Structure 1
Amino acid sequence: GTILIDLSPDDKEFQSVEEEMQSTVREHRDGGHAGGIFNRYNILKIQKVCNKKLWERYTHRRKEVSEENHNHANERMLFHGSPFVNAIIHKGFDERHAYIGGMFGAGIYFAENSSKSNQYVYGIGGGTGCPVHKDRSCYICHRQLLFCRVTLGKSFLQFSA
């Protein structure tokens, strides 16, 4: 039951999402190995994802977590990149989208840096890059990222180097 609605480039909403995207590019310690070498993006399209069933699924879990965290959902907007994006927007996030070997535990990972999520669009470590050119730094082929509403509730603070 998923519908995609195109936002106009002249819409404030489009512009706000684009700015989050562009303003959270950073350099990475792999020198661009996984996600490519770039300082900014060319945004081709931004679509709103509408699925009534998946939304109520989210707001029902949000209410539980909120009440468990003393009326504080601790909800954020965060990026997610994945080879499974098309399954996610239709069926929602689940265990299949988790990262068994993530260094913060076997769960579903999200990023404040858009360029961090970009590292996973073609798989862990960038996989073999784009299908057509096998180029992890391809400037030609189109990529997709998700910008997601995420309920953190009571979050455990883990420092990492």
Structure 2
Amino acid sequence: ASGTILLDLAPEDKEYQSVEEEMQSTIREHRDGGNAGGIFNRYNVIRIQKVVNKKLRERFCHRQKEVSEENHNHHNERMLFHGSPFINAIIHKGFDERHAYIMFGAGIYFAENSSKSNQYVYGIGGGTGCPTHKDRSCYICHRQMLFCRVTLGKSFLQMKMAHAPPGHHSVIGRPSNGLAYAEYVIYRGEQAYPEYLITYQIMKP
């Protein structure tokens, strides 16, 4: 069963404010002209909850400990965004690499820009948007994403692979041409904790 408890953050909470700040301030314009994630300069944040799960926390702490001693006591933790159709499963069971499907590999994908993760909320390339209106840019329907602690360890900089390279703990596609914004990939579910569940809407400009 799940040992997951959702704690509601009051909007007047400072923690609530730091999270939304991170989410708002990392919005970027993407190459697709808003095709996948929609068109917006801002979110409307409805809810932000802390995911509390003890066994999950320990699995994260145990792995981070291992990565640390593998990487000169640097676990290289970053707060990163995740988007996918499987948020509800993740807050209950945790990220699972066995659930990774076919992108740029068979791993778990994170973005430093919330708007990039927002592109995955309704599927790869935004699917066909919200269920009701089939609108990738719907300003009505509610969306969710995650703000996660991720153990990057020693990252590899690069197209499709199964695991991190020898001596590494994560793969990062850095902008170059090539990518517009960084993508962070891990191939072990316990190297990310789904810290905050964010429920939101995109706002019409």
TM-score using structure 2 length: 0.75
Q: What's 2:153 paired with? A: 153
SS at match of 1:101: coil
Match of 1:61 among 60, 63, 69: 63
More helix by share: 1
Match of 2:96 among 94, 97, 105: 94
TM-score using structure 1 length: 0.95
- How many residues get paired? 159
1:21-60 alignment runs, 5 A limit: 21-60=23-62
The more displaced of 93-102 and 68-77 is 93-102
For 1:14, the aligned partner's letter is Y
Q: What's 2:168 paired with? A: none
For 1:129, the aligned partner's letter is G
Structure 2 unmatched ranges of 5 or more: 159-173, 179-205
Shift of 1:100: 3.0
Task: Measure the CA separation in 1 of the matches of 2:98 and 2:129.
Answer: 21
Q: How high is the sequence identity, in percent, across the aligned residues? A: 86
Shift of 1:107: 1.2
For 2:72, the aligned partner's letter is H
Q: What's 1:120 paired with? A: 120
Task: Measure the CA separation in 1 of the matches of 2:148 and 2:40.
Answer: 23
For 1:5, the aligned partner's letter is L
Task: Measure the CA separation in 1 of the matches of 2:15 and 2:72.
Answer: 31
Structure 1 unmatched ranges of 5 or more: none
Does the 8 Å contact 1:80/1:146 carry over to 2?
Answer: yes
Coordinate RMSD, CA, aligned: 1.1
Shift of 1:99: 4.5
SS at match of 2:85: coil
In structure 2, the CA distance between the partners of 1:22 and 1:115, relative to structure 1 (3 Å rule), is: same
Shift of 1:156: 1.1
Q: What's 2:10 paired with? A: 8
> Residue by residue, what CA displacement relative to the aligned partner does 1:75-110 show, whole Å, maximum 9, x if unpaired?
0100000100000000011124425332xx321110
For 1:156, the aligned partner's letter is F
The more displaced of 6-15 and 90-99 is 90-99
Q: What's 1:144 paired with? A: 144
